Design a binder for this molecule. Structure first.
Ligand SMILES: NC(=O)c1ccc[n+]([C@@H]2O[C@H](COP(=O)([O-])OP(=O)(O)OC[C@H]3O[C@@H](n4cnc5c(N)ncnc54)[C@H](O)[C@@H]3O)[C@@H](O)[C@H]2O)c1
Lengths: 333, 337
């Protein structure tokens, strides 16, 4: 078992934790969050507005929680440099506070004896998408990141189109569920004015590096994609809308068959999924895929110009990929 | 000199017909003198006119009688007929009838209003009649076209944008997405929708893929674009205001700055004034509530991958813009006899 510490017990931190309870090869042994105490922490585990109630046994002390009888240490430390991760045998720290997305600060987790760090967001570190480039990990890379939820949805789709038909150029939109960075009312957002507007009552254009980032995980696509986002009032589950020009001709049937084949390959099993059903966003709540290709919603203008639609639970799929990446890179020493 | 004030009848006081009516109260180039409906009585009509969850309260005197309503002293006759051939529009001086039943789109069907005395009919939706978008092809109207339609709100947003791109740089091909506010055809809970399974799912709690013919229909108002665009929609939980997201390949190289200039110049032209607007501000959808443009180009949100491949973002109040375009089309075609 790989012993994991979680820094920042938020939407991603708490769902990484629930996901870990379903795995036999990884175990969360320590949690840090400065806005919680252990008794409050088990309340936040128990009740979840998106993913429902957790029904296992939950107990607390003043410095630990117990989940189905297993004790997990709880820190409350604002500075990563001060977290004694090594004292509790933590091998990997999940860095999911949202405020240490830099190699500079995320590396301070190693000072306390963690051995590796996975940042749960894009960062100035090696970047990985499971299914696409996780086998490029090198053992000296002590601090890495798992990209964004959007990159994890788009990269498998782009790899299938590019490998089968070749992507000449592409532009992406993601229609994205609300996240914690948005306010409930019109509020200050110095670096992103539109992002300060009331989240629940607006379609809000937003910038994203996900399409560019696909060029980092798929090098031959460097410079050939870009895109943007619209934030909309839903609680969870987002969708990628990728318009691209293909080098070689592909009928809509050939695109469907390529996506279906890919969803059945060892490389993308559980990561890229395939549907022909009349689905809507809530149908992917608690679906652990990184990407589900929507055959009926995707459309072609012609054999060289297509719009592909792919769904992702931005909370649950990404959290499961964080654990997948930890397991994958842990085998590389 | 000036043009006459066109007398209009509204058939179907549903959401579109009622917003056309409200738009006409804010204006002086047209007046609605008669309203027909069968799900409403005159006292209930003034309640729906007075209060609006999107567009605010109407300030002005509203009264009702057994067969009419009064706005600021002016009497408007209210009908409750089933077979529109008997409707005596001509007795009340009605020149144009706005067909906002949300059903009637058969050419002969809509023509029944001419038996009562109306001269012309505008269908407030796509239909198997001549099709028009203000600023794009309204000057193609011929006086023998007694029944016409104003396309859809999405086509009225997309077509001005496509005209500027196509005329300045040339569209080779394009794929469009519209992220669209809720409409009345969607239910509040998961409910049967036999011709559209996704569209029966609860509207307020889902992103819902949907079909739209709007990108293909651009070929009807811009014939050289026939077969060069298609697209789709995502319905999302907002009350009003939608956005077109158009990904285009261009013939002539265009920098992002040249695209901005072309949209800006179009917004200042007599052809597109008040129809296509331009912004460089950090806007969000609620900033377009009660904005009567067909389309507002969003400079900061639009993005170019290269000089030949661009994504253009354009906002539209799907309720208020289209309602004002219906009245504009009435007026524009009334001048052609
Ligand atoms: N929510 C998503 O859909 C999603 C998907 C992929 C990646 N991410 C990324 O993952 C990160 C977390 O996002 P989230 O949505 O879980 O955020 P969140 O606001 O729900 O959680 C952040 C947590 O960090 C805690 N925290 C803040 N500063 C801390 C500190 N100094 N020490 C310890 N704890 C601290 C907060 O109390 C909070 O519980 C962000 O970088 C975000 O961009 C989010």
């Amino acid at each position: 078992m790989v012993k994991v510490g979680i820094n920042g017990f938020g939407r991603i931190g708490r769902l990484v934790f629930r996901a870990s309870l379903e795995r036999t090869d990884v175990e969360v042994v320590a949690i840090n969050d400065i806005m919680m105490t252990p008794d409050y922490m088990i309340y936040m585990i128990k009740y979840d507005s998106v993913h429902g109630k957790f029904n296992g046994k939950l107990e607390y002390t003043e410095n630990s929680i117990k989940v189905n009888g297993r004790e997990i240490h709880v820190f409350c430390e604002r500075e990563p440099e001060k977290l004694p991760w090594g004292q509790y045998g933590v091998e990997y720290v999940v860095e999911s506070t949202g405020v240490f997305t830099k190699l500079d600060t995320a590396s301070k987790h190693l000072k306390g004896g963690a051995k590796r760090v996975v940042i749960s967001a894009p960062a100035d570190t090696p970047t990985f998408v499971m299914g696409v480039n996780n086998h490029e990990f090198k053992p000296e890379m002590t601090v890495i990141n798992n990209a964004s939820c959007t990159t994890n949805c788009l990269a498998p789709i782009a790899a299938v189109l590019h490998e089968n038909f070749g992507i000449v150029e592409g532009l992406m939109t993601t229609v994205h569920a609300l996240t914690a960075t948005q306010p409930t009312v019109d509020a200050p957002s110095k670096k992103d004015w539109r992002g300060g507007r009331a989240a629940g009552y607006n379609i809000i254009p937003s910038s994203t590096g996900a399409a560019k980032a696909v060029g980092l995980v798929i090098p031959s696509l460097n410079g050939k994609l870009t895109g943007m986002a619209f934030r909309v009032p839903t609680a969870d589950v987002s969708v990628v809308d990728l318009t691209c020009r293909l080098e070689k001709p592909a009928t809509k049937k050939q695109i469907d068959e390529a996506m279906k084949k890919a969803s059945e390959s060892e490389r993308f099993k559980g990561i890229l999924k395939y549907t022909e059903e009349e689905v809507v966003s809530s149908d992917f709540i608690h679906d652990s895929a990184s990407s589900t290709y929507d055959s009926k919603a995707s459309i072609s203008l012609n054999d060289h110009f297509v719009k592909v639609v792919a769904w992702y639970d931005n909370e649950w799929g990404y959290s499961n990929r964080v654990l997948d990446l930890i397991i994958s890179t842990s085998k590389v020493q």
